[PDB]
């Protein structure tokens, strides 16, 4: 039948979908969510053989183990075991577009398991098998007999195995197809893998059983009273003596309980549902659920007889909260949300798409610790445990159907096709059926990048009809179609419109007010954290805070999808698209996360953390005003620490308890500040520290910070005049300057400082020269590639202008002696094919104190693309252990991504001064630096710098960090000016005008001396 090439057959013999069950046979276990002996895991070692097509599978496998099979752990993705290659393709489908067909060579994974079943499960009741995740379709046999088939790789497929098993040993056989017509609906931008990748379990339920249950909670106007409504359905024989009891508990206290026989109210001319009952429980002053305080109750649903015998129990965590859109705003418990969200795919660098509880927990804790309060399931329903974690830790969730047909042309070709409505319907309906009792899910999504088709409209209505408790969103077709309650664009800019035909991406501020528009706007994806990125992040937050209807967004995205490979030496390395021989592929576009695949943060996460703070601050005088952005909680685990330092030198500090109601303000007066000892800038830094541990943080966690400059006393004191004057030696070849133990050499033919010595030690490996380029970031390169250049990408503009190839022409090099110093004057022109790109005029003035003051004035031709940077660079001879500086830090920071950095004195090992992005590029800059110390050298001024053992040239020539090699010495890049890094998206220029070096003329000054 080739059911895998027919969108009309998405399953055979599969059981209905329903919320998580466990069939407890003890009610107390159900109350506390204890393991159920009736719900067994079949995870562990299974038998597996790979074939190139279903046609190659031997019939013998149905009845007997294949001797050639191997033993492997399940769940797993077979690519992760090496049986075939995983493929990283973004939009283009990994298979030829010829719906509903798939390739004839279609990798088939044959899995089997011999396992025991006790007679007690078979004497009464029903025994079903549950596959929580099988990618992408499969047939199942039990003891040689065919049982059924299923599609939708991200929802559980359940089959009744009652009539197929026997006491003792039994054998399952699962034939899993890599590609199927379901693949047409699974075009998400992620690695393409396959296998039995989520749990497999066996559940025993009695013949008379709870087959479904829906919990709703409704409130009065101020949320001081709620009614919990639980509709319960049964299967099996109706009998007057059956009863359902629904009890609600808060911890160990029973709050309410209600019992009723089956028999629902009249629904229409034919009667009501005799197989259902709805229990209604009143709750006075309920403790409400929120991401701020995830208060939970437990609903326990008991199926029993009137005389008191329990048949079985099911149950769930219940969070009392209301979600609604009113007057253009999304409200939770009546208050308007500010979504500090992130998209998160299910990805593990070693396990592929298999998720585990440790990793899940680790992600949620980092999220919370980084001031995220919400997550979008991009782009499919997740492993069931994720929802339980979000309910208990407290995160708002966007649950999204596993529907993405991005590679179709036009994008809605299938979603506007009624013949695809069935398949799409089950992807939405089965998800709601499974997840509708989780309080953490606050919004449903119809899928991702599948255009806008009538199928969407039908499904949007279906959800609105069956679950009015939550809004429905969907971005396809323009982000604001009739299929979305929320304007949910991806990568729309704050102030800049991108007026694409048919599906424009308007500036978000402007979008809200188009004629007739009244919906809230929450970006489904924003700020593309690929590589050195997140430039412009603060611009979103300032807009979200100023505009009521801009209610936030989900950052793109949480974690890089890099996979681990091993080199010839067995050492691991991070790989991306094309590294498995996969092609076509989309190379590094699979890595766009705030964190690396192992969960180590990239520097951008700190930027997110700061912009997403829940406390805002203002300073007036000595008065700090703290305003809380919490909607529900008081600041009862928070104190404010303040410190004032003079040029990094600590002057005073204190602590004050924060006592701020939600949305309230607190005024803190700082104490009088005595006058600092000397000249300099006083700076105030305040931080909010949580003194007590929480379920998601350690005691002492810092949740927010901010700084301000205080009084400045400019230095007006004259330095004590040199007890010696420098000596110049002129030669045809060089201008040399000597002063004591020091010596500086200026090459007269190049016009550069080519060498310096301290004692008899040379300090330079390469001369000090102007630098106007950077090893291109992912955002500078965009979609450009050698075989397919994007002439609009910054990198190509610079390349085409000759920025990377221009050579300095010396125009002038002179030496003069002053009363107390020697003065070298240079001027160089950088040219390309006859065009003068930049002109650098400098003076170096070396005085009796041993200091070399460098003044630089650059001219940039107005018609050349604005340059990446304006600075100097050199390779120093030394490698020292520490980097110490007075400037912004401690982490990497760029012009358009420096708000989280603080001005202070920082000292880190040199390796921390390098950010190991997988795809290497310019990295490690620190901006707003007034002093930098390395080895015996000190440089002072107002500049940006990076320092590491890798040259810009090496960085731009290397595609994978594991291939980099430390060079002799230390490469220092000191910039007077650096361009922004951008990031609103990674496929089009995204550096805002104010961060482009378009001024024409630039000036900067450095003092280089010994320390």
Ligand X SMILES: OC[C@H]1O[C@@H](O[C@H]2[C@H](O)[C@@H](O)[C@H](O)O[C@@H]2CO)[C@H](O)[C@@H](O)[C@H]1O
644 scored as a contact of its own copies (CB under 8 A): no
CA 151, 154, 158: angle at the middle one, nearest 5? 60
| # residues contacting ligand X (CB under 6 A) | 8
Residue holding tokens 């092609």?
583
d(CA 100, CA 378): 24
35 scored as a contact of Mg ion (CB under 5 A): no
Query: Of 469 and 825, which has the nearer Cβ to its own copies?
Result: 825
d(CA 281, CA 276): 17
Q: Which does 783 bind (CB under 5 to 8 A by kind): its own copies, Na ion, ligand X, none?
A: ligand X
475 scored as a contact of ligand X (CB under 6 A): no
Query: Of 451 and 776, which has the nearer Cβ to Mg ion?
Result: 451
Q: Which does 589 bind (CB under 5 to 8 A by kind): Na ion, Mg ion, its own copies, none?
A: Na ion
- Taking CB atoms, the residue at the shortest distance from ligand X is 189
721 scored as a contact of its own copies (CB under 8 A): no
Dihedral sign from CA coordinates of 783, 450, 983, 348: negative
In a 3-state reduction of DSSP, which class is residue 465?
helix
- Environment class of 169 (CB within 10 Å of its CB; exposed 0-12, middle 13-18, buried 19+): exposed
Q: Which of 726, 1003, 714 is nearest to 851 (CA)?
A: 726
Per-residue string for binding with ligand X, 537-576, x by CB under 6 A?
----------------------------------------
| # residues contacting Mg ion (CB under 5 A) | 9
Pairing between strand 195-196 and 807-817? Answer: unpaired
Q: Which does 920 bind (CB under 5 to 8 A by kind): ligand X, Mg ion, Na ion, none?
A: Na ion
Residue 295 token pair: 């208060």
d(CA 940, CA 884): 12
For helices 421-435 and 454-466, give the axis angle rounded to 10 degrees: 30
Give the containing element (helix H, strand E) for 61: helix 60-63
d(CA 22, CA 392): 19
Contact set for ligand X, span 667-696 (CB under 6 A)? none
Phi and psi, residue 793, nearest 5° = -60, 140
Contacting ligand X (CB under 6 A), which of 157, 333, 592, 628? Answer: 592
923 scored as a contact of ligand X (CB under 6 A): no
Query: Of 212 and 859, which has the nearer Cβ to its own copies?
Result: 859
Contacting its own copies (CB under 8 A), which of 239, 618, 649, 709? Answer: 709
Query: Of 163 and 711, which has the nearer Cβ to its own copies?
Result: 711
d(CA 290, CA 723): 70
6 scored as a contact of Mg ion (CB under 5 A): yes
13 scored as a contact of Mg ion (CB under 5 A): no
490 scored as a contact of ligand X (CB under 6 A): yes
d(CA 883, CA 877): 15
Contact set for ligand X, span 178-217 (CB under 6 A)? 189
Residue holding tokens 């010829």?
98
Smallest separation (angstroms) from Mg ion to the CB of 681:
37
Q: Where on the phi/psi map is residue 502: left (φ > 0), alpha (ψ -120 to 50), or beta?
A: left
d(CA 735, CA 753): 9
Q: Please give the sequence-ordered ranges of beta strands (E in DSSP) within 251-294, or none if there are none.
A: 253-260, 276-284
Contact between 49 and 58 (Cβ < 8 Å) = no
Query: Of 533 and 773, which has the nearer Cβ to ligand X?
Result: 533
Provide the β-strand partners of residue 397.
375, 441
Per-residue string for binding with ligand X, 142-181, x by CB under 6 A?
----------------------------------------
Q: Which does 275 bind (CB under 5 to 8 A by kind): ligand X, Mg ion, its own copies, none?
A: none
862 scored as a contact of its own copies (CB under 8 A): yes
Q: Which does 168 bind (CB under 5 to 8 A by kind): its own copies, ligand X, Mg ion, none?
A: Mg ion
Query: Which stretch in 18-26, 187-195, 656-664, 858-866 sits in contact with its own copies by CB under 8 A?
Result: 858-866
Query: Of 475 and 638, which has the nearer Cβ to Mg ion?
Result: 475
12 scored as a contact of Mg ion (CB under 5 A): no
Q: Which does 550 bind (CB under 5 to 8 A by kind): Mg ion, its own copies, Na ion, none?
A: Na ion
Residue 947 token pair: 């320092």
Contact set for Mg ion, span 142-181 (CB under 5 A)? 168, 181
449 scored as a contact of Mg ion (CB under 5 A): yes
811 scored as a contact of its own copies (CB under 8 A): yes
Per-residue string for binding with ligand X, 506-535, x by CB under 6 A?
-------------------x----------
Beta carbons within 10 angstroms of residue 305's beta carbon: 13
Query: Of 387 and 491, which has the nearer Cβ to Na ion?
Result: 491
Smallest separation (angstroms) from ligand X to the CB of 673:
49
Residue 119 token pair: 């007679």
Contacting its own copies (CB under 8 A), which of 371, 836, 875, 988? Answer: 836
Query: Of 409 and 714, which has the nearer Cβ to its own copies?
Result: 714
Q: Which of 486, 524, 528, 521 is nearest to 507 (CA)?
A: 521
Q: Which does 638 bind (CB under 5 to 8 A by kind): Mg ion, ligand X, Na ion, none?
A: Na ion
Pairing between strand 753-758 and 761-762? Answer: antiparallel
Residue 317 token pair: 């965590």
Smallest separation (angstroms) from its own copies to the CB of 823:
8
Q: Which of 246, 156, 260 is nearest to 202 (CA)?
A: 156
Query: Of 453 and 976, which has the nearer Cβ to its own copies?
Result: 976
Query: Of 61 and 554, which has the nearer Cβ to ligand X?
Result: 554
d(CA 777, CA 793): 11
Contact set for Na ion, span 537-556 (CB under 5 A)? 544, 550
- The greatest distance separating any two alpha carbons of the chain, rounded to the nearest whole angstrom, comes to 113
Pairing between strand 852-860 and 87-89? Answer: unpaired
Query: Of 165 and 575, which has the nearer Cβ to ligand X?
Result: 575
Query: What residues have CB less than 8 Å from 654, skipping those under 6 apart?
Result: 641, 642, 670, 671
Contacting ligand X (CB under 6 A), which of 10, 38, 76, 90? Answer: 90
d(CA 865, CA 897): 22
Phi and psi, residue 321, nearest 5° = -160, 155
Enumerate binding residues for Na ion (CB under 5 A).
189, 544, 550, 589, 592, 635, 638, 658, 920
Enumerate binding residues for Mg ion (CB under 5 A).
3, 6, 9, 168, 181, 189, 406, 449, 899
Enumerate binding residues for ligand X (CB under 6 A).
90, 189, 490, 525, 589, 592, 783, 987
Enumerate binding residues for its own copies (CB under 8 A).
681, 709-714, 716, 718, 809, 811-812, 814, 816, 818-819, 823, 829, 831, 835-836, 839, 857, 859, 861-863, 942, 1001, 1003, 1005
């Amino acid at each position: 039948r080739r059911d895998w090439e027919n969108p009309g057959v998405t399953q055979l013999n599969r059981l209905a979908a329903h919320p998580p069950f466990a069939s407890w046979r003890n009610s107390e276990e159900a109350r506390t969510d204890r393991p159920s002996q009736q719900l067994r895991s079949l995870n562990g070692e299974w038998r597996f053989a790979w074939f190139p097509a279903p046609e190659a599978v031997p019939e013998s496998w149905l009845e007997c183990d294949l001797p050639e099979a191997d033993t492997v752990v399940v769940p797993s993705n077979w690519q992760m075991h090496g049986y075939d290659a995983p493929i990283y393709t973004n939009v283009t489908y990994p298979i030829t577009v010829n719906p509903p067909f798939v390739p004839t060579e279609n990798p088939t994974g044959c899995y089997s398991l011999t396992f025991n079943v006790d007679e007690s499960w078979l004497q009464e009741g029903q025994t079903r098998i549950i596959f929580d995740g099988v990618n992408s379709a499969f047939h199942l046999w039990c003891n040689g007999r065919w049982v059924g088939y299923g599609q939708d790789s991200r929802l559980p497929s359940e089959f009744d195995l009652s009539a197929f098993l026997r006491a003792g040993e039994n054998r399952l056989a699962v034939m899993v197809l890599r590609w199927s017509d379901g693949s047409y609906l699974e075009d998400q931008d992620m690695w393409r893998m396959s296998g039995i990748f989520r749990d497999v379990s066996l559940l025993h339920k009695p013949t008379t059983q709870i087959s479904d249950f829906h919990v709703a909670t409704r409130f009065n106007d101020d949320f001081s009273r709620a009614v919990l409504e639980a509709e319960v359905q049964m299967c099996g024989e109706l009998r007057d003596y059956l009863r359902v009891t629904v009890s609600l508990w808060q911890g160990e206290t029973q709050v309410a309980s209600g019992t009723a026989p089956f028999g629902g109210e009249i629904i229409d001319e034919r009667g009501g549902y005799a197989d259902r009952v709805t229990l209604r429980l009143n709750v006075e002053n309920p403790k409400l659920w929120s991401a701020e305080i995830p208060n939970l109750y437990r609903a326990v649903v008991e199926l029993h007889t009137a005389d008191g015998t329990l048949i079985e129990a099911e149950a769930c965590d219940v969070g009392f909260r209301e979600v609604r859109i009113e007057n253009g705003l999304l409200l939770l418990n009546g208050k308007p949300l500010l979504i500090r969200g992130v998209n998160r795919h299910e990805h593990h660098p070693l396990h592929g798409q298999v998720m585990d509880e440790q990793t899940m927990v680790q992600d949620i804790l980092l999220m919370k610790q980084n001031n995220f309060n919400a997550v979008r399931c991009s782009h499919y329903p997740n492993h069931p445990l994720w929802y339980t974690l979000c309910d208990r830790y407290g995160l708002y969730v966007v649950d999204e159907a596993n529907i993405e047909t991005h590679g179709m042309v036009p994008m809605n070709r299938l979603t506007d096709d009624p013949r695809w409505l069935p398949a799409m319907s089950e992807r939405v309906t089965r998800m709601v059926q499974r997840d509708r009792n989780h309080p953490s899910v606050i919004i449903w999504s119809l899928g991702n990048e599948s255009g806008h088709g009538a199928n969407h409209d039908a499904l949007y209505r279906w959800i609105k009809s069956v679950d009015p408790s939550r809004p429905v969103q969907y971005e396809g077709g323009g982000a604001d179609t009739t299929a979305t309650d929320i304007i949910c664009p991806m990568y729309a800019r704050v102030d800049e419109d991108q007026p694409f035909p048919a599906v424009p991406k308007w500036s978000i501020k402007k979008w809200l007010s188009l004629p007739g528009e009244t919906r809230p706007l929450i970006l489904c994806q924003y700020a593309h954290a690929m590589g050195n990125s997140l430039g412009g992040f603060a611009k979103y937050w300032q807009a979200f805070r100023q505009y009521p209807r801009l209610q936030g967004g989900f950052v793109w995205d949480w974690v890089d999808q890099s996979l681990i490979k091993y080199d010839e030496n067995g050492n691991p390395w991070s790989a991306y698209g094309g590294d498995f021989g996969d092609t076509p592929n989309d190379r590094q576009f699979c890595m766009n996360g705030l964190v690396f695949a192992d969960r180590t943060p990239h520097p951008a996460l700190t930027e997110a953390k700061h912009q997403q703070q829940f406390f805002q601050f203002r300073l007036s005088g000595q008065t700090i005003e703290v305003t809380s952005e919490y909607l529900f909680r008081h600041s009862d685990n928070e104190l404010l620490h303040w410190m004032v330092a003079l040029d990094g030198k600590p002057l005073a500090s204190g602590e004050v308890p924060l006592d701020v109601a939600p949305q309230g303000k607190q005024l803190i007066e700082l104490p009088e500040l005595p006058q600092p000892e000397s000249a300099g800038q006083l700076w105030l830094t305040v931080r909010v520290v949580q003194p007590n541990a929480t379920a998601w943080s350690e005691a002492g966690h810092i949740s927010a910070w901010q700084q301000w400059r205080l009084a400045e006393n400019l230095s007006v004191t004259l330095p004590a005049a040199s007890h010696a004057i420098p000596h110049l030696t002129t030669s045809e070849m060089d201008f040399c300057i000597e002063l004591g133990n020091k010596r500086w050499q200026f090459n007269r033919q190049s016009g550069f400082l080519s060498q310096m010595w301290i004692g008899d030690k040379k300090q330079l490996l390469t001369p000090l020269r102007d630098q106007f380029t950077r090893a291109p970031l992912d955002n500078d390169i965009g979609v450009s590639e050698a075989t397919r250049i994007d002439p609009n990408a910054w990198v190509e503009r610079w390349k085409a202008a000759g920025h990377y190839q221009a050579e300095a022409a010396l125009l002038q090099c002179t030496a003069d002696t002053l009363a107390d110093a020697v003065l070298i004057t240079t001027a160089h022109a950088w040219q390309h094919q006859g065009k003068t790109l930049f002109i650098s005029r400098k003076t170096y003035r070396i005085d009796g104190s041993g200091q070399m003051a460098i003044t630089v004035d650059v001219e940039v031709a107005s018609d050349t693309p604005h340059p990446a940077r304006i600075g100097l660079n050199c390779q120093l001879a030394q490698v020292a252990e520490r980097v110490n500086w007075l400037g912004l830090g401690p982490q990497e920071n760029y012009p358009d991504r420096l708000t989280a950095a603080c001005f202070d004195r920082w000292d880190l090992p040199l390796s921390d001064m390098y950010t190991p992005y997988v795809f290497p590029s310019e990295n490690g800059l620190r901006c707003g630096t007034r002093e930098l110390n390395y080895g015996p050298h000190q440089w002072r001024g107002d500049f940006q710098f990076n320092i590491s053992r890798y040259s810009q040239q090496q960085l731009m020539e290397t595609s994978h960090r594991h291939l980099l090699h430390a060079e002799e010495g230390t490469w220092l890049n000191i910039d007077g000016f650096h361009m922004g890094i951008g990031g609103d998206d990674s496929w089009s220029p995204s550096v805002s005008a104010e961060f482009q070096l378009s001024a024409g003329r630039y000036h900067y000054q450095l003092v280089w001396c010994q320390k």
